[PDB]
Design a protein around this ligand. Structure first.
Ligand SMILES: *[C@@H]1O[C@H](CO[C@@H]2O[C@@H](C)[C@@H](O)[C@@H](O)[C@@H]2O)[C@@H](O[C@@H]2O[C@H](CO)[C@@H](O[C@@H]3O[C@H](CO)[C@@H](O)[C@H](O)[C@@H]3O)[C@H](O)[C@H]2NC(C)=O)[C@H](O)[C@H]1NC(C)=O
Ligand SMILES: *[C@@H]1O[C@H](CO)[C@@H](O[C@@H]2O[C@H](CO)[C@@H](O)[C@H](O)[C@H]2NC(C)=O)[C@H](O)[C@H]1NC(C)=O
Ligand SMILES: *[C@H]1O[C@H](CO)[C@@H](O)[C@H](O)[C@@H]1O
Ligand SMILES: *[C@H]1O[C@H](CO)[C@@H](O)[C@H](O)[C@@H]1O
Ligand SMILES: [Ca+2]
Ligand SMILES: [Ca+2]
Ligand SMILES: [Ca+2]
Ligand SMILES: [Ca+2]
Ligand SMILES: [Ca+2]
Ligand SMILES: [Ca+2]
Ligand SMILES: [Ca+2]
Ligand SMILES: [Ca+2]
Ligand SMILES: [Ca+2]
Length: 416
């Protein structure tokens, strides 16, 4: 029936209550009558101060350990006055003080959310506990800011609270594979204590990105006399998908195209090289289509264009299409004696032909229609001074290194 109050975690020997006044006696009388305390468990932590004539604490008083989460912390002791033969009941309340932070059971948690996870899905979060009760228990859950997540305080009927992370915006690990959040838990008493909990969010990969070539069309020029195996090109295709979902193989699209037989595209490195010799005079252009795939068979498509260059390799060929061999000695300057056809299978300046004959001879070569030539006469001839002629005609293309074919025209001069 003697109520008192005391703060916990207080020093030893702190005043609990003026017992001698509420007993109607002096301190020396308390030390004289032999008034003691009845031997019970909790009463071990209290003691009687005669000089102070009061009630002092003789041990550590932790409410969090003593009464746990009960709403009032009460300790009842019985005081026995022997000479008066009377007994008194003392009820002592212990107040709560915020010396315990909200302690998370787990310091960190990994939440594996898929890349293709739809918004609205919620995942459980680590809970906190505060041995401090009342307003000194947990009161505020503060989640670190993030554009993709929110904090929901779902309350099961039994559980007082249950924090959970809510996915409100879609994710893509191709931009960020892992997130890091700070889950602060604070109790609403002064001084304000708190404790955090780091939450890593691992975004698992989904093969949602297909291989994409750097350029849609690849153009490359090449000489026709390149040795087989020469590195013509090296194609690159990017796949941001993780690991095995990013390993890309390149291959030709067509099924055993002749161009695919002529060339080799390496599967792993994508290096396009020559396999067999290729002549400009057969095909000057090669249009092929290549593709790149990850393991998910996601298709990227591109087109490689190969242009050949006509380096000189074919010499001209002279075809004497006409020859008026019995030449008249009295022929006027300007009469034709032989028509020639010249043809260089090469192209450009490598296919342009020029013809040459000796200077001392009275016969010149003149150009004509459709790369023809005519062997014209411009000076009169002494029949005996020149009876037989073995003319050397040299056809040569204008592409270095020049190629030359020589044809010999046999003729004889006759008179009348
Ligand atoms: C007009 O002249 C050409 C060649 O031009 C002249 O003769 C050469 C020998 C050189 O001195 C040149 O600088 C010169 O301007 C005559 O062509 C020649 O034809 C003969 C046979 O028709 C070739 O003989 C060859 O001999 C070898 C080895 O014996 C054989 O394997 C061959 O099968 C072939 O028989 C000779 O090589 C060839 N000249 C050249 C340079 O190739 C051409 O006959 C002549 N015209 C007339 C009407 O006489
Ligand atoms: C318990 O309470 C009594 C009464 O309130 C206290 O007695 C007072 O002591 C002070 C000491 O300076 C005096 O000035 C007052 O005149 C006293 N009042 C009365 C009514 O006696 C006493 O000191 C307190 N403590 C103990 C151990 O008895
Ligand atoms: C948790 O938050 C409180 C503020 O409410 C801080 O004072 C404390 O140090 C902890 O960071
Ligand atoms: C929240 O963050 C702090 C660092 O500021 C940690 O020390 C704590 O354990 C919790 O993870
Ligand atoms: Ca305490
Ligand atoms: Ca406390
Ligand atoms: Ca607390
Ligand atoms: Ca993606
Ligand atoms: Ca992905
Ligand atoms: Ca991929
Ligand atoms: Ca050629
Ligand atoms: Ca050529
Ligand atoms: Ca040529």
């Amino acid at each position: 029936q003697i109520r008192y109050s005391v703060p916990e975690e207080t020093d030893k020997g702190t005043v609990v209550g003026n017992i001698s006044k509420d007993l109607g006696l002096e301190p020396r009388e308390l030390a004289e009558r032999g008034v003691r305390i009845v031997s019970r468990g909790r009463s071990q932590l209290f003691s009687l101060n005669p000089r102070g004539g009061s009630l002092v604490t003789a041990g550590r008083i932790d409410r969090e350990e003593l009464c746990a989460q009960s709403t009032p912390c009460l300790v009842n002791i019985n005081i026995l006055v022997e000479e008066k033969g009377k007994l008194f009941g003392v009820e002592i309340e212990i107040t709560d003080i915020n010396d315990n932070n909200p302690k998370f059971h787990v310091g960190d948690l990994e939440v594996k959310i898929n890349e293709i996870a739809a918004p609205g899905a919620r995942y459980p979060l680590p809970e906190a506990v505060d041995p401090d009760v009342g307003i000194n228990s947990l009161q505020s859950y503060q989640l670190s800011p993030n554009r993709h997540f929110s904090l929901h305080l779902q309350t099961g009927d039994d559980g007082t609270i249950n924090p959970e992370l809510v996915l409100e915006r879609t994710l893509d690990r191709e931009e960020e594979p892992t997130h890091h959040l700070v889950l602060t838990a604070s109790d609403g008493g002064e001084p304000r204590r708190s404790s955090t909990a780091l939450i890593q969010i691992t975004v698992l990969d989904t093969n949602d990105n297909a291989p994409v070539f750097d350029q849609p069309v690849y153009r490359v020029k090449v000489l026709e006399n390149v040795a087989p195996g020469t590195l013509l090109l090296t194609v690159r295709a990017s796949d941001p998908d993780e690991g095995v979902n990013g390993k890309v193989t390149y291959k030709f699209r067509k099924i055993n195209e002749k161009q695919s037989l002529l060339f080799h595209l390496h599967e792993n490195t994508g290096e396009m090289t020559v396999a067999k010799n290729l002549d400009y005079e057969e095909c000057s252009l090669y249009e092929m289509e290549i593709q790149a795939e990850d393991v998910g068979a996601l298709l990227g498509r591109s087109k490689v264009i190969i242009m050949v260059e006509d380096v000189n390799d074919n010499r001209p060929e002279v075809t004497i299409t006409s020859l008026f061999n019995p030449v008249l000695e009295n022929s006027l300057p300007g009469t034709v004696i032989a028509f020639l056809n010249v043809h260089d299978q090469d192209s450009g300046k490598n296919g342009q032909v020029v013809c040459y004959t000796h200077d001392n001879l009275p016969f010149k070569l003149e150009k004509s229609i459709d790369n023809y030539y005519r062997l014209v006469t411009w000076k009169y001839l002494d029949r005996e001074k020149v009876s037989t002629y073995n003319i050397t005609v040299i056809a040569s293309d204008l592409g270095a290194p020049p190629l030359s074919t020589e044809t010999y025209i046999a003729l004889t001069v006759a008179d009348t």
